[PDB]
Amino acid sequence: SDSAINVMKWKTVSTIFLVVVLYLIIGATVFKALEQPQEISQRTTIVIQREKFLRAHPCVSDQELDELIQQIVAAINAGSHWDLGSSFFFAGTVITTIGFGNISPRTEGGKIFCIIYALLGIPLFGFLLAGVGDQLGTIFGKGIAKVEDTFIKWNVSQTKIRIISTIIFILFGCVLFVALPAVIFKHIEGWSALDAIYFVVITLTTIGFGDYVAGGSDIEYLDFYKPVVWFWILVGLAYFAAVLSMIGDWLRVIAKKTKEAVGEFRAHAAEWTANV
Amino acid sequence: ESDSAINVMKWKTVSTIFLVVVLYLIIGATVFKALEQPQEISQRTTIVIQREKFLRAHPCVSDQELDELIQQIVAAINAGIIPLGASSNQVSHWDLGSSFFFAGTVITTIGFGNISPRTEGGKIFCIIYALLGIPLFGFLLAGVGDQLGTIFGKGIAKVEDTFIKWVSQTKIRIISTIIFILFGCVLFVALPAVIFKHIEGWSALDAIYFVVITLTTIGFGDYVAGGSDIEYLDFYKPVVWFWILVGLAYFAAVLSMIGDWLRVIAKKTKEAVGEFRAHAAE
Numbered sequence A: 001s002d003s004a005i006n007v008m009k010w011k012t013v014s015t016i017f018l019v020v021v022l023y024l025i026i027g028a029t030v031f032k033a034l035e036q037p038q039e040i041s042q043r044t045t046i047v048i049q050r051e052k053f054l055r056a057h058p059c060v061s062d063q064e065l066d067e068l069i070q071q072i073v074a075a076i077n078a079g080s081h082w083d084l085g086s087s088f089f090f091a092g093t094v095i096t097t098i099g100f101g102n103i104s105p106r107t108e109g110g111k112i113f114c115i116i117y118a119l120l121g122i123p124l125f126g127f128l129l130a131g132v133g134d135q136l137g138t139i140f141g142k143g144i145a146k147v148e149d150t151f152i153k154w155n156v157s158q159t160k161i162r163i164i165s166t167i168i169f170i171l172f173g174c175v176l177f178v179a180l181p182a183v184i185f186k187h188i189e190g191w192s193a194l195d196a197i198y199f200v201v202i203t204l205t206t207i208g209f210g211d212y213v214a215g216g217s218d219i220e221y222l223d224f225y226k227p228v229v230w231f232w233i234l235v236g237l238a239y240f241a242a243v244l245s246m247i248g249d250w251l252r253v254i255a256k257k258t259k260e261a262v263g264e265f266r267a268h269a270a271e272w273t274a275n276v
Numbered sequence B: 001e002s003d004s005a006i007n008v009m010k011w012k013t014v015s016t017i018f019l020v021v022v023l024y025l026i027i028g029a030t031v032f033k034a035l036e037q038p039q040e041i042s043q044r045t046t047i048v049i050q051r052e053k054f055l056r057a058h059p060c061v062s063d064q065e066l067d068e069l070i071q072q073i074v075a076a077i078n079a080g081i082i083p084l085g086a087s088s089n090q091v092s093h094w095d096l097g098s099s100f101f102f103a104g105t106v107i108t109t110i111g112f113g114n115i116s117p118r119t120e121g122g123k124i125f126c127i128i129y130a131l132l133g134i135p136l137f138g139f140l141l142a143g144v145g146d147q148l149g150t151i152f153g154k155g156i157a158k159v160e161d162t163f164i165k166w167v168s169q170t171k172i173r174i175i176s177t178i179i180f181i182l183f184g185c186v187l188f189v190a191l192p193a194v195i196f197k198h199i200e201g202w203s204a205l206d207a208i209y210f211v212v213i214t215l216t217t218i219g220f221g222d223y224v225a226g227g228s229d230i231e232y233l234d235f236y237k238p239v240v241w242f243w244i245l246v247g248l249a250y251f252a253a254v255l256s257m258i259g260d261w262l263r264v265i266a267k268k269t270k271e272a273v274g275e276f277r278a279h280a281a282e
């Protein structure tokens, strides 16, 4: 029977799917909870700012303000953006699929090229990010050859120290690729503590909202900064990739334990209810 | 456990790719400023034109405070404001279902980002939500790919039988891969782009563009399906969810297929250089 196996699979697909569906639902309700209020208070005070700009400047008639705002919304569809190096940045947002999109093509040619550039770049960059991960993996693999010797000749031994080693990756990894660069961005970009960490995560997961961008504002940047941030991305993507994947297997583990633990609760209500 | 003889062979391959990437970026960059710098200038001279016609048409406005005004508008437009008087009431951006949409942009890492948290809590949650969701959604997109793969696997069991005429094994692989790309383009690129053109009002190019940008999970968010207030059959948006769920699993294989094509090109070209050497000497 071969449809027997596919019904085993589609059972597993559907349950995950509903987990995702319900993870979204829980998510949605927490975001609306967090953002609906702050959306109201920003919408009442933006109508305050508006009528206060008719009274604090009686020169402005009510009719020609509507015209200005149309002109500004029009110019949010443009904003140099496409200078010799921000177009290099842009090519970066494509092939990493971070895609901040503060900058995005407007020419139909630029869109058509971007389509081609992506279908060829996103694979290509991939191979780099695998090598970047290969080397960086054997770097930390040597690192545990040094730490899995001095702690393994004494106090409590194997099968739990794997749980200690994985902590050292996440802890040192957070420092090198989350903490240290967030501190840098705090000073250089002017972001708060939270915003910098936020920007790290959003960008290294390649979510890349682009509500925050490293380099995006009109500051003096020391000519070493932006290229250090390239290297950070190049390396830090390969880090989160493993980080996300590690979380991946943890879910697999949790899903086994929980599934069989439900089975335990079942087998003890049965023989609790047989007992009359 | 991990010798230096093989890792030197690897770091040789990493570095060459890296410089290919570096150069692919450079070529890219130069084609994009080529395409976009001009149209950035002409929009940016005519925005200074529009400016002076209401710099000096109203000198009573402080005019330091006009450049401050636009700062106050664009800063507030990234939460999403409709600051007007002939439409002062305002549909919610974090309503029941747009926050559901947003949670979608996170765990798929499309991240359009027209909407993004402002609250410190929303940022903190979003960080947690992503580190747990991006793995989770992964599992779904693997099953979604599993089923969809065995669907097309049965499809070729029907087509790899009737085209057995007086046939190779490794050459019908080249016929199969064509029907994946052909039918896949129609189901997941062409047909939905046509839908979007009608429903969203986008041109032909914009729709296809939006498909690709979104299905690769680039997700600039210069275009979004559902983003405006228009009508929305609400048959529509849930169909688009399903399209994404399936279409991500499609591009994943599509991009991966391109992946091995590069592997193949990189083999032929590497050995062709070596031949080009002994044959340019002559």
Ligand SMILES: CS(=O)(=O)Nc1ccc(C(=O)NCc2ccc(Cl)cc2Cl)cc1
Pocket (backbone or CB within 6 Å): A080, A081, A082, A085, A086, A089, A092, A093, A096, A098, A102, A103, A213, A214, A215, A216, A217, A226, A229, A230, A233
């Ligand atoms: C509106 S602007 O585009 O013209 N200003 C800029 C903003 C950022 C950069 C830049 O290179 N930042 C570092 C970086 C590099 C590669 C990648 Cl993929 C992501 C990131 Cl954050 C340049 C200009």
Ligand SMILES: CS(=O)(=O)Nc1ccc(C(=O)NCc2ccc(Cl)cc2Cl)cc1
Pocket (backbone or CB within 6 Å): B092, B093, B094, B097, B098, B101, B104, B105, B108, B110, B114, B115, B224, B225, B226, B227, B228, B237, B240, B241, B244
């Ligand atoms: C002002 S608004 O931004 O809040 N307007 C909305 C915009 C879009 C949607 C929506 O569901 N679109 C389909 C969809 C679904 C899931 C994913 Cl991941 C991507 C996409 Cl395109 C809902 C509201």
Ligand SMILES: CCCCCCCCCCCCCCCC
Pocket (backbone or CB within 6 Å): A108, A109, A110, A112, A113
């Ligand atoms: C013989 C020249 C043909 C190329 C024409 C370039 C002029 C600019 C027109 C751009 C039209 C958009 C298509 C670009 C696709 C690369």
Ligand SMILES: CCCCCCCCCCCCCCCC
Pocket (backbone or CB within 6 Å): B181, B185, B189, B208
């Ligand atoms: C190698 C066979 C050629 C197939 C080229 C199609 C690649 C897929 C890119 C998406 C283009 C969709 C076609 C839209 C035409 C209106």
Ligand SMILES: CCCCCCCCCCCCCCCC
Pocket (backbone or CB within 6 Å): A120, B013, B016, B017, B020, B262, B265, B266, B269, B270
């Ligand atoms: C019009 C399409 C142009 C794009 C062609 C891309 C070809 C990619 C060749 C890359 C060479 C890889 C060598 C790597 C050696 C490890």
Ligand SMILES: CCCCCCCCCCCC
Pocket (backbone or CB within 6 Å): A176, A177, A180, A181, A184, A228, A229, A231, A232, A235
């Ligand atoms: C062998 C060295 C490994 C890379 C160390 C990463 C340091 C972080 C630099 C990025 C700071 C923005």
Ligand SMILES: CCCCCCCCCCCC
Pocket (backbone or CB within 6 Å): A112, A115, A116, B204, B205, B208
């Ligand atoms: C009116 C139809 C617009 C078609 C635009 C061409 C799209 C090119 C993408 C295909 C590249 C392989």
Ligand SMILES: CCCCCCCCCCCC
Pocket (backbone or CB within 6 Å): B020, B024, B027, B269, B270, B273
């Ligand atoms: C789109 C840019 C293609 C760049 C061509 C790279 C060819 C490099 C040859 C290196 C010798 C192996």
Ligand SMILES: CCCCCCCCCCC
Pocket (backbone or CB within 6 Å): A003, A006, A007, A010
């Ligand atoms: C044999 C696994 C398939 C179970 C039936 C569900 C198929 C629905 C396909 C999507 C319409």
Ligand SMILES: CCCCCCCCCCC
Pocket (backbone or CB within 6 Å): A258
């Ligand atoms: C060691 C697990 C603690 C993390 C929270 C677990 C959520 C409960 C799931 C049921 C096992």
Ligand SMILES: CCCCCCCCCC
Pocket (backbone or CB within 6 Å): A022, A023, A026, A258, A259, A262
């Ligand atoms: C968000 C998780 C809700 C509790 C887990 C429900 C899954 C049970 C599947 C057996």
Ligand SMILES: CCCCCCCCCC
Pocket (backbone or CB within 6 Å): B187, B191, B192, B239, B243
């Ligand atoms: C049978 C697998 C796919 C069937 C429907 C796909 C069409 C999506 C239209 C948006």
Ligand SMILES: CCCCCCCC
Pocket (backbone or CB within 6 Å): none
């Ligand atoms: C569509 C233009 C491609 C430019 C690259 C030419 C060199 C192969």
Ligand SMILES: CCCCCCCC
Pocket (backbone or CB within 6 Å): B194, B198
């Ligand atoms: C609005 C439907 C037009 C039919 C598609 C033609 C463009 C290929």
Ligand SMILES: CCCCCCCC
Pocket (backbone or CB within 6 Å): B097, B098, B234, B237, B238, B241
């Ligand atoms: C945004 C309204 C559509 C909600 C769909 C929910 C599950 C498909």
Ligand SMILES: CCCCC
Pocket (backbone or CB within 6 Å): A019, A254, A255, A258, A259
């Ligand atoms: C099988 C359910 C997994 C949720 C953690």
